[PDB]
């Protein structure tokens, strides 16, 4: 597995975010914080997502949150203040939920490349990010592995939730589930199920986990990055059974069925126009903190087929005995599904 490992680190250096790009995004966060401070002093602007957890690809987008205690006008007023500051953007309202999307920066020196998403009181997203940051700190192998999977999923056109496949966060959870509960010895302990974990309730959910990393013993797993990646691909390709099983972080053995979960069901809720929005559980990934949410709800039968197929193709490629193996095929673009 040594040469594949070499390949992975080489690609990882290519696709990871530069310090320079990281610096510019950081500066942008500061400028945006000033704008919020002028109109609301007590309000806070918080970064989350890939950039905050160090799990970001090149040219990633910022995910930010404006949070406040106890109001309805601040979303629009912020957007207006941002436009006035020379930013270019959109103000979006759907299902009574407001979002701000910045697409360019004309005055402060970030250029037209600048892109940003701002949301309001998304506390759960912040805590999800905190967990991911902890694991990223825990083992050096996690960051390259996650980045490569993200790159792989994007290229194989299985990273489009709106078109039937899986979100980036879902794949990270798949990786994390594999490292904690599948591979032996475990790369990771389960921080949620730790003895030292203390209950913390935010928005009616337990978001608490053991975040005292220095007291956590070193990993008993000494596999190379290439070895972890191959095993991860092979597991979902063959071992994992999506029809009966749930990806979860709430079980010591990581064993949960949809039947016990109650996610065998196809399920419906009504949108703002009272259309039927069906929640599929064809792929079941139970969000670590938001238990009700299925991160995999977006996957469809055609979608799961494509995802599983790429997993098989990846495994077969790495398992292949016809040297020299074409590792670059792993990241070559796939014909886009019509």
Question: What are the b/e assignments for 275-289, b being 16+ CB within 10 Å?
Answer: eeeeebbbbbbbbbb
CATH 1.10.1410.10 range(s) for the chain read 1-16+139-338
Classify domain 1-16+139-338 at the CATH class level. Answer: mainly alpha
Helix (H) or strand (E) holding 146, with range, is: helix 142-155
CATH 3.30.460.10 range(s) for the chain read 17-138
Q: CA 319, CA 153: separation in Å to the nearest integer?
A: 19
Q: CA 77, CA 91: separation in Å to the nearest integer?
A: 10
Which positions make up the binding site for UTP? 50, 125, 128-129, 150, 154, 168-169, 293
Which positions make up the binding site for ATP? 297
Beta-carbon neighbour count of residue 121 at 10 Å? 14
Tell the CATH topology of 17-138: Beta Polymerase; domain 2 (3.30.460)
Which positions make up the binding site? 50, 61, 63, 125, 128-129, 150, 154, 168-169, 293, 297
CB 55 within 8 A of CB 147: yes
Helix (H) or strand (E) holding 309, with range, is: helix 301-319
Q: Shortest CA distance to 139 belongs to which of 17, 22, 236, 223?
A: 223
Which positions make up the binding site for Mg(2+)? 61, 63
Q: Phi and psi (nearest 5°) for 199? A: -60, 125
What are the distances in angstroms from CA 294 to CA 152, 234, 246, 290?
22, 23, 10, 8
Give me the helix-helix angle, 2-15 and 225-234, nearest 10°: 90
Q: CA 284, CA 190: separation in Å to the nearest integer?
A: 19
CB 32 within 8 A of CB 64: yes
Cis preceding-peptide flag for 145 (omega within 30 of 0): no
The three-class DSSP label of residue 272 is coil
Name the one residue in this structure whose structure tokens are 């609301």.
40
């Amino acid at each position: 597995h040594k040469e594949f490992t070499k390949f992975c680190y080489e690609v990882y250096n290519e696709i990871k975010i530069s310090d320079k790009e990281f610096k510019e995004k950081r500066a942008a966060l500061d400028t945006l914080r000033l704008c919020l401070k002028r109109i609301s002093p007590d309000a806070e602007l918080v970064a989350f997502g890939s950039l905050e957890s160090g799990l970001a690809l090149k040219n990633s987008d910022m995910d930010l949150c404006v949070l406040m205690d106890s109001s309805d006008t601040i979303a629009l007023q912020f957007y207006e203040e941002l436009i006035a500051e020379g930013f270019e953007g959109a103000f979006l309202q759907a299902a009574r939920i407001p979002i701000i999307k910045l697409t360019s920066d004309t005055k402060n020196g970030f250029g037209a490349s600048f892109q940003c998403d701002i949301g309001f009181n998304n506390r759960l997203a912040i805590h999800n990010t905190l967990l991911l940051s902890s694991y990223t700190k825990l083992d050096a192998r996690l960051k390259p592995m996650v980045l490569l999977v993200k790159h792989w999923a994007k290229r194989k056109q299985i990273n489009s939730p709106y078109f039937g496949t899986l979100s980036s966060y879902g794949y990270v959870l798949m990786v994390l589930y594999y490292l904690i509960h599948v591979i032996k010895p475990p790369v990771f302990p389960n921080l949620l199920l730790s003895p030292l974990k203390q209950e913390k309730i935010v928005d009616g959910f337990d978001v608490g986990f053991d975040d005292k990393l220095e007291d956590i013993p070193p990993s008993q797993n000494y596999s190379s990055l290439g070895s972890l990646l191959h095993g991860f691909f092979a597991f979902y390709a063959y071992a994992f059974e999506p029809r009966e099983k749930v990806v979860t972080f709430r079980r010591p053995d990581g064993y949960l069925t949809k039947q016990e979960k109650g996610w065998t069901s196809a399920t419906e809720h009504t949108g703002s126009a009272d259309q039927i929005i069906k929640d599929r559980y064809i792929l079941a990934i139970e969000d670590p903190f938001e238990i009700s949410h299925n991160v995999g709800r977006t996957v469809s039968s055609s979608g799961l087929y494509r995802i599983r197929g790429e997993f098989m193709a990846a495994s077969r490629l790495l398992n292949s005995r016809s040297y020299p193996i074409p590792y670059d095929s792993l990241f070559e673009e796939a014909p886009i599904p019509p």
